[PDB]
Design a protein around this ligand. Structure first.
Ligand SMILES: O=[N+]([O-])c1ccccc1O
Ligand SMILES: [Mg+2]
Length: 352
């Protein structure tokens, strides 16, 4: 049967004072008939989305800043102030519901040391469970400067993640600048889930892999939504090319490269969530490659509907159990993987 106490952890908010900013997101991601509900949910962490979560058997929601969030703020000082305001806000919101709400840090990713300190403040002072960062940090006019976290100066930040022993959720964001104009203006409906978001995240996390981040920090934990942002279908092709071309080519030049095969990182350092991917067939394929213990249920609210995402997992319990390898695998994906990963105490319906 279906289960209660599900953990859901790609669930976005915005600062209520910036409700006007949400309207631009609604233009990019929200059908007209879903606008009222979106605006209610994105601006009210304890509102109707909490009632829906209770109704639909979610025991624990981890909130995060929506996208791009700080990653779209191009002025370092403004970005840092905004991230702090977001963390203080969601801390105050979740304070009243500790048995069923947690949060991920919003971070300005302009400076590794400053981001490290804000993550440390969130985890150690606010009880946050990790970080959620919306892909590259944008800087300069129109955000044309793309700051990637797979370069060596970010080692001080990955060290902080490992010291705090919390995961880093690498979430997508829209295109900026010349990339937006050159490659998306003539196909604007592909901004978002259809191709742009995965294209960016997969580039970034593969960049972390091939630049040696997980070799230097073997205990680093990273989370990708959407069942791995295109990578699982290409597990064979990517590692094949690494064996056939990239690894020996890099070695011949003395260039840094991933020391281990791609699947090693997805079996040790990376977890997937089911956000916006309520697909039993895709889930099965992923399970067959990374293991049922490495995939976490999630909805992607408010861009997805809690009743739809929970409806998939609950109403199709038997078929999904068959797909993922039995009743334990099911409860694991729904709840117990996350309970273990985030070291969760007792929470709402956590043993239901
Ligand atoms: O994660 N998503 O796919 C997503 C899609 C559209 C808008 C925001 C999001 O977070
Ligand atoms: Mg999302």
């Amino acid at each position: 049967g279906s289960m209660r106490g599900k953990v859901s952890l790609e669930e976005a908010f915005e600062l209520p004072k910036f409700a006007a900013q949400t309207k631009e997101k609604a233009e990019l991601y929200i059908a007209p008939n879903n606008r009222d509900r979106y605006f209610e949910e994105i601006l009210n962490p304890c509102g109707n989305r909490l009632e829906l979560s209770n109704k639909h058997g979610i025991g624990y929601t981890i909130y995060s800043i929506y996208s791009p969030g700080p990653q779209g703020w191009t002025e370092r000082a403004e970005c840092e102030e905004y991230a702090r305001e977001c963390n203080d806000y969601i801390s105050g919101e979740i304070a009243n519901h500790k048995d069923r709400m947690g949060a991920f840090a919003a971070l300005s990713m302009h400076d590794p040391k400053q981001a490290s300190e804000e993550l440390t403040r969130c985890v150690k002072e606010l009880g946050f469970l990790g970080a959620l960062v919306n892909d590259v940090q944008h800087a300069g006019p129109e955000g044309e400067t793309h700051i990637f976290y797979d370069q060596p100066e970010w080692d001080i930040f990955w060290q902080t993640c490992v010291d705090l022993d919390v995961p880093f959720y690498l979430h997508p964001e829209p295109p900026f600048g010349s990339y937006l104009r050159n490659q998306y203006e003539g196909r604007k409906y592909l901004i978002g889930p259809p191709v742009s978001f995965a294209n960016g995240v997969s580039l970034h996390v593969l960049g972390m892999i091939v630049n040696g981040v997980f070799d230097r920090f073997p205990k680093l934990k990273v989370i990708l939504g959407h069942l791995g942002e295109h990578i699982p279908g290409d597990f064979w092709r990517i590692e094949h090319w690494f064996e056939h071309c990239s690894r020996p080519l890099a070695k011949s030049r003395g260039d840094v490269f991933a020391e281990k095969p791609l699947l090693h990182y997805f079996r040790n350092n990376i977890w997937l969530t089911t956000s916006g991917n309520f697909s039993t067939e895709t889930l099965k394929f992923c399970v067959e490659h990374v293991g049922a213990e490495r995939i976490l249920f999630s909805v992607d609210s408010p861009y997805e509907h809690i009743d739809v995402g929970c409806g998939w997992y609950d109403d199709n319990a038997k078929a999904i159990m068959e797909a993922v390898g039995g009743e334990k695998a099911y409860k694991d994906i729904g709840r117990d993987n996350a309970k273990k990963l985030f070291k969760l105490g007792k929470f709402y319906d956590s043993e239901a």
